Amino acid sequence: GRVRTKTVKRASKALIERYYPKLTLDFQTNKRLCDEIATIQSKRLRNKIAGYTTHLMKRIQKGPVRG
Amino acid sequence: AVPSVQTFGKKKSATAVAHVKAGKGLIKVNGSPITLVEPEILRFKVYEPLLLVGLDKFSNIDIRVRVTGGGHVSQVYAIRQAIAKGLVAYHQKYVDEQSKNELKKAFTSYDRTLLIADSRRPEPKKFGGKGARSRFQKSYR
Amino acid sequence: QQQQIIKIRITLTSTKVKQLENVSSNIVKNAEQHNLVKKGPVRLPTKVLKISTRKTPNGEGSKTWETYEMRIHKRYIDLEAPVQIVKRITQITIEPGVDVEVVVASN
Amino acid sequence: ALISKKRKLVADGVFYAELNEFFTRELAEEGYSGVEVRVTPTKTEVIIRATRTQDVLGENGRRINELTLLVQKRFKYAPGTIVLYAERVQDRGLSAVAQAESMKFKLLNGLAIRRAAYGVVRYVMESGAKGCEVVVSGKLRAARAKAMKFADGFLIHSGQPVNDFIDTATRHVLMRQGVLGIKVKIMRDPAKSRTGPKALPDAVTIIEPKEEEPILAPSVKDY
Amino acid sequence: PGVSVRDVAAQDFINAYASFLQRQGKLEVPGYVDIVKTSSGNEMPPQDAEGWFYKRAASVARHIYMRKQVGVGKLNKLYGGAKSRGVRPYKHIDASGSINRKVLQALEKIGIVEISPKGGRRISENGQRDLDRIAAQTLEEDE
RNA sequence: UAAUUGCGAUAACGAACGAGACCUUAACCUACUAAAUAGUGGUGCUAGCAUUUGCUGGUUAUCCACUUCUUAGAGGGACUAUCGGUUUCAAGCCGAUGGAAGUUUGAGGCAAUAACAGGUCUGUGAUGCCCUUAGACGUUCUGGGCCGCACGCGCGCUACACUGACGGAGCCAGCGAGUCUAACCUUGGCCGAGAGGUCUUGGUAAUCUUGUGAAACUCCGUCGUGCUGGGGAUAGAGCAUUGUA
Fold first, then answer.
1. Misc remark for this entry (chain A)?
2. CATH classification of the domain holding B65
3. DSSP B15
């Protein structure tokens, strides 16, 4: 169901690992930011990655994470 | 001036046209009007929503669709959204938008998902079967 | 007396449309060159070509099937312009499709 | 009301279908690749693609003229409408049918199978594709039946966006023992495609960040 | 003072036309009525034993003015009945042509419909006259 | 969780195929803006409930405008997006929501390595082997049978009105179908209760057939308690069409 694969988590990690301090919690703003930055050929992944990125941002804002 | 606005869609067996040009109040869908229609068989859908807005409501709205469509119940389900559009648009762009929004909030729970986009269709038929999802019976030995 | 009126319907054979957009841009430019009134292109519904067949040389075993379709589209455009400019598309800047087909079509 | 078009839009298909079938049947020794046709006013712009164009050209009138006359009489055109002329091939080692016919000749001339089999795939990988494989069915000994195969690089199969850059070449050979069938599906690089979707759906890339800025108060200078 | 924009009713209009044309007797029926089965797809012939010709005349008159053109094939296919085709799935089949041909000829003899371009025939200038003055006001005062 | 989908201490590390990602279709924008094929308005207006120029037939270079009636030719489509519960509190999962949607937004296509003595020498004009090749198992013309039936087996239509018909009201919308080596669609006129002879826009299809003109369903009267508008197996006469037959 609502479960994620390898490449989406990998992209989220590699995305925050060079653009931590930007990309506000708003999902649409995260969408526009990732569109400006990367070139995701899978146009559905272009919107799917944003949810996981903002979720991980909420996690780090609440507190530190593993790894 | 404005030549033509855009809006159209597909009912279960009818279609829509942005032919709502300038008029002077009267409303007629050329097949089931308000004035001289007389079905007197299934009028619950028109008795329901026309309560506390006004009965005449003929000021400057006129649904004037040249073409037409429908079936046996697509027509009742089409005049349903037609009167919904008529009621909301009579108060939006003519009577005060305060009246429109208060009437809408009063009529919140009466649009039975009438604001959704057109995505309600049946399914195609799967091969190797009689009906849509149904499959042919096997020949065990 | 040059610069006449015809309202001619000209045909063309292809499937894509970017050539049609290029042709419309070019004819709009050449019409603006000497203040000529434009005309819009043709537009039609799509199409589908269903060919239901089996997926086997002999019909034993399972009962699978197969279908496929196409979307080829010859077009024809209704331009109001004279012959000297009608005949210019096939001459000036030759590319795949950007041409003109001689035909009479005004009645 | 003058109403017919599927009678001819499919004729356009079956035309080059039959033509390229005939070309695959006839142009064996060349190492055939394919065709490409465009319709124009009174000149069907037809091109064939070949790797040994000198052979099929002959002495400017040994083969091309008679091919044009064949295609002429096939339909009763006006001699002068059709224009049959060859064209050099780019990425010669990438034509799957070309490599298939090559391996066919390398088998029929009386050479060991596996040697040339891994030789040709090494050659095309040296030419610089993404990956390729090879499989051969039938028998290679006084035996029952087997299917030998091997590959290198990387291969993908399958979905919708494989068909664009994956090739297909399934061919036969009629030897003294029995009919054998070889299949090759070379996968070319996605970046150098230059046509259609470049990157894979699985693929993904992220550009680099910006530059850094120290504190830098507004202004204290002489100007 | 005439016909409105869209004044219409169904079974009352049908019965009114029937009972009005009954006491006139100017239809001049052919004579082979009450032997036919109404179609090549009927289960049994009519049972009234006196009528239905008038009813079909009233029916076709109840939309000669509702629609622009008309067609004998369309009028037959409107009620091309379902055949009880033995041990078989039922199927619709076109109505009888002779009944519609004759009722149309009788209506034309009365002078309701007339040959006209843009397809076959059309409601006549007598139809214009009767929706203007006589039939419009007659139906108004009758209902 | 749909899963070798992820979390995870981990003699494992780093990669591939499958999964997935992907394509098709049901999807909105008051648009980039489109088509005398749906056709649109003020139709200048003309014959049609009046001191209600808007339409009914339409003015075949009727206006400035053309998509507003199909469409993608495109592009943005809109994702766990917020609260609760819930587990190293991280994977993930159920309710409340405003709303195109909330098993993966529905369904279809696309398919891993290794195999089966699985089907197909009757798609081959693709073949190894043997057989036949002049009294032919090659090919061609006339006629029968492959529909024959003492007996079993496996799909599928009709049937046990009472929840079943006759005259009528919806014929409107839906994926298709139709030729310069000429036979496909049928419009209104005539006698036609199955065909037939008319002249029509018809052979480079939103234009003509079909304005994609079905039955299912209900009431005004007639139809009843069975073997009556439940039955139609099995047979006998007649009117006909297609095709050399």
1. Present with 30500 molecules/cell in log phase SD medium.
2. 3.30.230.10
3. B
